[PDB]
Amino acid sequence: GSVVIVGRIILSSITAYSQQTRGLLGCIITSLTGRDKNQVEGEVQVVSTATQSFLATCVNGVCWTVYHGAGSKTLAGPKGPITQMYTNVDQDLVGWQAPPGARSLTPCTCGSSDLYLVTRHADVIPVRRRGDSRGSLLSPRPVSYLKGSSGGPLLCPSGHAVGIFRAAVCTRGVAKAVDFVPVESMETTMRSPVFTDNSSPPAVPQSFQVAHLHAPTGSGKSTKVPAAYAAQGYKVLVLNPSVAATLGFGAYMSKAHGIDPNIRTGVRTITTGAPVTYSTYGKFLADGGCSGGAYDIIICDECHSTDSTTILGIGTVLDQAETAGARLVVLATATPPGSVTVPHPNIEEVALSNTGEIPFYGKAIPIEAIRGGRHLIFCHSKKKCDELAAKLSGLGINAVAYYRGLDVSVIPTIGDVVVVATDALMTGYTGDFDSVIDCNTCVTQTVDFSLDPTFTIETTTVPQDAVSRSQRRGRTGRGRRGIYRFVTPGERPSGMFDSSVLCECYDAGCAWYELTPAETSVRLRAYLNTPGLPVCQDHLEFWESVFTGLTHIDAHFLSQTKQAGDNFPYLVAYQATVCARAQAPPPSWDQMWKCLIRLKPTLHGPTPLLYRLGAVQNEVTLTHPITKYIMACMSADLEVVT
């Protein structure tokens, strides 16, 4: 779908009023066609996608809005879809060349500290400028009131544009300040070159530099380029999220490039003294990050990946590498932030219909599409994997399920098979397939700052983003012909991750890598501050405050949550620690809380709830001082997008 103009805010002192120009049906047809004949007028547009409505503001002949609303989408235009002229994911800023008829605001330069924010309800809200990109509301309002207003102008009294609104700063759901993209960032973006070529490895610089390498899988980002560097006499570390891919690089390299590299993973280490080392991000973190003078070049491969080990690994590199004597860090991915899935030569893409013997996510799979050959079917949950595999096996098709917890040996690796897998496949198994069939959805975790009493981690099923779609499809068509079948043609924008992932980073720092919350913060700050990487709201101080209060955890409970391998071993174990010590029961008797089972007869009373990691069946008390501490942590400034 395209972004589509559905109304405008007419500006006049400053006053405004709105016009709606399209209803639902109009919006939807126009999004699918990309063809908008409606005459555009004014400098502020009300825009919508399928899921969301926000604002857009024309300045210097460019219609600007936020990446978090528009992603990389085209804008429906008089002659068809308009592709973005500017995309700056770090600044949360995108722009399309303004269509004919649209007026621009003029940048504000004299620079008043009295500002006026124009919202989607056509209210004009006074704001006191506090920085380059920040202003305080004279009257604090519920954030709910500012939602849908992303992309709207902050104006000085003369009606010139200071910037566009991107986020609210909140104390317990009440917005006290606003963050905006300043016009100077728009000017810097306009002056940058549209096409910057990152497809080729950079030469080693004289002094330290961080570079980006955007190149497809099979381009030898992880083999040919490290070989070339070693041949120039450098020492090179290559980090990858997958154990299977890390181990695989070693056999390929001693064969294809005459180097027997060091290999470091949790399951297996090999030290040959060679000048190339392959390691997982997790093992790299276990080994204590950069060792002084060990490496000249560090390649962080699959740097689009937003699991917490990778982010924490990369932040460690970015924080430590210069000081450890490295001259070059290379951030490598085939799918950088803001990338979109485009046709691939090796891969025929065919929509699933309703005809076929096998139900699948509301559509169907013909038995003939998978009867012989080697096929991969991506499902969102292990439950779906188990059931679809059982169904296929019942029909005599050789089928197997793979997901977190199973050994990859369930394979086969040779011969006819249908593999039914979650995304755990990506990191567990490196092979390719004749076809990939994709449900186009993913399970994710999102934090809800629900104040009941503290926060909640919610597990939801969502539409896949463009990284997911590209990585799942990329399991077919590798140096041979392939087919990608799909349920849905969409893809969410890439390059963004939820605050829950930050929480997971602190959790893993504490649970696995012996990192203080303060140390985790230094490493994440380096990640956040480095451009060209996936982006997130800055909740570092908040999450640091939370974990900082979680002292004297019970080692035994932690070992058991770590061992059982579920998602926030430290939060889980810590809640179990305070339950045991308070001599009180867990929030429920779900599997999550099994580490308390032997104390179940001597439990009793309401649970001293710290936070919500699932359904809470038992009664709760809010009297525990850790609860009160975490409650106090909720008063921190929290960036929230509008």
Ligand X SMILES: [NH3+]Cc1ccc(F)c(Oc2ccccc2)c1F
Residues involved in catalysis: 68, 92, 150
Hey, what are 10's tokens?
């007419």
Cβ of residue 617: shortest distance to its own copies, in angstroms?
6
Could you give the strand order of the β-sheet that contains 435-438, starting from the edge strand earlier in sequence? 347-351, 482-486, 435-438, 374-378, 417-421, 399-402
14 binds its own copies (CB under 8 A): no
Contact 151, 163 (CB under 8 A): no
108 is in an annotated binding site: yes
CA 143, 149, 150, 156 torsion-angle sign: negative
Q: Smaller CB distance to its own copies: residue 129 or 384?
A: 384
The values of phi and psi at residue 414, to 5°, are -140, 140
Q: Which of 92, 319, 423, 491 binds ligand X (CB under 6 A)?
A: 92
160 is in an annotated binding site: yes
25 binds its own copies (CB under 8 A): yes
48 is in an annotated binding site: no
Q: Which of 61, 362, 405, 625 binds its own copies (CB under 8 A)?
A: 362
- Using CA atoms of 568, 571, 576, 577 in order, give the dihedral in degrees to the nearest 10: 130
215 is in an annotated binding site: yes
Cβ of residue 193: shortest distance to ligand X, in angstroms?
21
218 is in an annotated binding site: yes
Q: Which residue has the tokens 């004297």?
A: 552
219 is in an annotated binding site: yes
* Separation between Cα atoms, residue 346 and residue 476, nearest integer Å: 8
> What track of x and - describes contact with its own copies for positions 421 through 450 (by CB under 8 A)?
-----------------------------x
Contact 463, 1 (CB under 8 A): no
537 binds, among its own copies, ligand X, none (CB under 5 to 8 A by kind): ligand X
Cβ of residue 315: shortest distance to ligand X, in angstroms?
15
Which residues does the chain break after (C to N > 2.5 Å)?
A: 12, 13
Q: Smaller CB distance to ligand X: residue 492 or 594?
A: 492
Return the CA Rg of the chain: 26
Q: Is 368 exposed, middle or buried (0-12, 13-18, 19+ CB in 10 A)?
A: exposed
Q: How many CB atoms sit inside 10 A of residue 606's CB?
A: 14
Q: Which of 3, 5, 44, 89 binds ligand X (CB under 6 A)?
A: 89
Residues 497-556 that bind ligand X (CB under 6 A): 497-498, 535-537
174 binds its own copies (CB under 8 A): yes
Residues 124-153 that bind ligand X (CB under 6 A): none
Show the beta-strand stretches assigned E in 380-481. 399-402, 417-421, 435-438, 441-448, 456-463
451 binds its own copies (CB under 8 A): yes
349 is in an annotated binding site: no
Q: Is 288 left (phi over 0), alpha (psi -120 to 50) or beta?
A: left
Residues 174-203 that bind ligand X (CB under 6 A): none
Contact 203, 185 (CB under 8 A): no
* Separation between Cα atoms, residue 433 and residue 482, nearest integer Å: 8
The answer, yes or no, to whether the previous bond of 453 is cis (omega within 30 of 0) is yes
409 binds, among its own copies, ligand X, none (CB under 5 to 8 A by kind): none
Cβ of residue 424: shortest distance to its own copies, in angstroms?
22
Hey, what are 637's tokens?
């400034």
**Total residues at interface with ligand X (CB under 6 A):** 11
7 binds, among its own copies, ligand X, none (CB under 5 to 8 A by kind): its own copies
Binding range to ligand X, per CB under 6 A, among 354-362, 369-377, 492-500, 551-559: 492-500
Query: Footprint of ligand X on this chain (CB under 6 A)?
Result: 67-68, 89, 92, 496-498, 535-537, 641
| Residues annotated within a binding site | 108, 110, 156, 160, 215-222, 302
Contact set with its own copies (CB under 8 A) = 7, 10, 17-21, 24-25, 28-29, 32, 50, 140-142, 171-174, 354, 359, 362-364, 450-453, 615-617, 619, 622, 635
